[model samples]
Target: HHLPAEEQLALIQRGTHEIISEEDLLKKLKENRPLKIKAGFDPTAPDLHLGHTVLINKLKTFQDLGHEVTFLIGDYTAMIGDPTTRPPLSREQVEANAKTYQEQVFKILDPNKTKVRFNSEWFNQKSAADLIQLASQQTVSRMLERDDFTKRYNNHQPIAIHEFLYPLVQGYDSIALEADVELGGTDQTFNLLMGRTLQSRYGQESQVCITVPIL
Candidate 1:
């Protein structure tokens, strides 16, 4: 339980693509409390894939060492997925999808040690006013700064408005959980950093972000 901080930190560093803010992690670790490590998943598909497991293994590392880990299943975000890439199933199928995530993840993660959560917990409670307030945190110009968005905007390719909200909505997950560290893949660097950005905007010590290669 009292493993040295350096060793504990090393366990986390092993497979990450990069640690976004190293100093913050060190400072947070020295505080003598278990860190709250979180990873979010969209139930875009019913099956768990290898890309997702890489981070799960890392999250398990944290839980094994006594840090709390939250596996956030994006139940609500699944609605957003169908618009851009993945499409939706029927109501019953969609409701069952979040439950499938737990069993697959637990194959790599310890059931007792892991905290499986649904994003709907907080999201469903948001009134239209709450949705507007959260959306106010981002600006259209800054969102257009993404290279992908810039390319699309320049080439006159259609882009969805809600697509821009994906990052901002994902970022709010960090705020909701007060995450100490959030982990994902290289492809997710944009979204992971969004969490870090929102954490600071909400006036909290931001989370340390880690990413593994997409593979």
Candidate 2:
């Protein structure tokens, strides 16, 4: 709790590609409280890719600084698939992959300090109406601003309706966990910022978005 904000900021900034607002992060560090940090992954694959370690290592840094880290598994989002155009995974597939993810992730992350949670925990109980309300927070034009969606639209590849909802569902995880910070790869900057936007809409303090370079 006594760590200087500058020191904390320096450690956090190492190797990061972009922090939505360094000023905001520095202010949070000055608060001297353990921040709730979350990094979400949709279990679309059975094995943790090598690129994931970059973000995982950053989470370890936060743990070292006494911040809370949540390894959020996006089980529900896996079903919708991200705008990147992967096929939807079945519930059984998501579970199997998520199990492997836990085993792999815990190998690097401090098992005793990290919180492993699934988005399905909250999403499973939500009605379509709940999702509709969440979707209402952002406009279609705003969604199109996402690079993947924009590319797909401009390239004449049809974007599915469910794909539009993926980012919103991903963003809702931050609200559910009441995250103070959310980490992702640089490609995820749009989705990470969406968490900040949705958090504020839900009357929670916006989370700081931290993006790591894609390795």
Candidate 3:
């Protein structure tokens, strides 16, 4: 607890692929309070890919530093299919797969310090008007700017209307929890950046994005 901010920064900065802005992270660390750290996991499969281990390792590091961590399971967004190429999952399938995530994640994350949450905790209660309000925050042009979305469009593939909403919902998770930092793989740069934009638009301080290598 008595460690200097410079020392803490060195520990977190160690082996990280990119810190959206190292400056923001340092400011938060200097505050010397537990920052709410969150990382969303898609329950598309019953187990994690090797790539996910990198992000989990970072989350555990935060827990080791005495910060609060949320292992957000994207049960709600899984149904919408984040990528247009992926198959949409049913609610039952999402629930079943979500169960396996905790069992595996807890192996690395400390159960006592981690918050296991589902997007459905708020999404299920949102009204049509509420979703519309949230959706209006970003423009279609901005949504299509994402790498995956752009590639799909250029290739003349169909992009489901629901797929465009995935990042919006994922970004809203940060605002809902007021996460100080959100972590993800380099592939999720756009989605993670969306959290910063949405949080600022919603009148909250934007979160710092810490991206890890896709191992």
Candidate 4:
């Protein structure tokens, strides 16, 4: 579902201000500097509904304002499956879902204004040495320090090893893109902050992160 230009811009402005400070956003805009704003979606389902349009509209607002927008398709991370809900999905299901997701995403976002990327481009390049180095960046205790993981661990539920790598891999994307700003739902604060942490380690200036209130 496409939104009219004015409506789209209004949605974007409203959604962005929910998280981003108006002063900071306006500073970047006035300098004629284009902010790199990104939103990543996992194609766990084939169809994207009206709910997804809200996010796409937000991206359009950034584009219309001359900010750069990147639409990330989590192909590589999807393979690990999302553990946020019940019953972890299989790798086969994730692969098929990603294919369908890419098709649907393009329908909402303009190709000319939005840059699309698949995490597989770099995730598939990881070596044992790289994994070892990545693992060393954070401690196992720290991984379990996450609220969800702490709750699950306290309940004696299993936490998948790959799940620990999820944030690291997602963080690596920030490093790869050298993004000026990243966006996500409030639930993703920890993961998104990891992107800034990792980016700083890579000698890139911290990517300003903007998170929207979760519905």
Ranking by TM-score: 2, 3, 1, 4
- Specify the highest-lDDT model's number: 2
In model 2, state the lDDT of residue 120. 90
lDDT per residue (tens digit) for residues 4-32 in model 3 = 77887887887787888878888888999
Write down the TM-score of every candidate.
0.89, 0.92, 0.91, 0.77
Evaluation by TM-score, superior candidate among 3 and 4: 3
Per-residue lDDT tens digits for candidate 1, residues 1-215, read 65788888888789888998778888887786889888887776876677676777888888888899998877765654342344655446656876787778888888887787877788878787876777788888878888788899999999987788778878888889999999887877777888898888889889998998656
Tens-digit lDDT string for candidate 4 (61-82) = 6776677898787777665535
Error of 4 at 29 (Å): 3.9
Candidate 4, residue 76: how far the Cα is off, in Å: 1.3
Best by TM-score: 2
Residue pairs in collision within model 4: none
TM-score: model 2 vs. ground truth: 0.92
Better of 1 and 4 by TM-score: 1
Tell me the deviation in Å of residue 142 in model 3.
Answer: 1.4
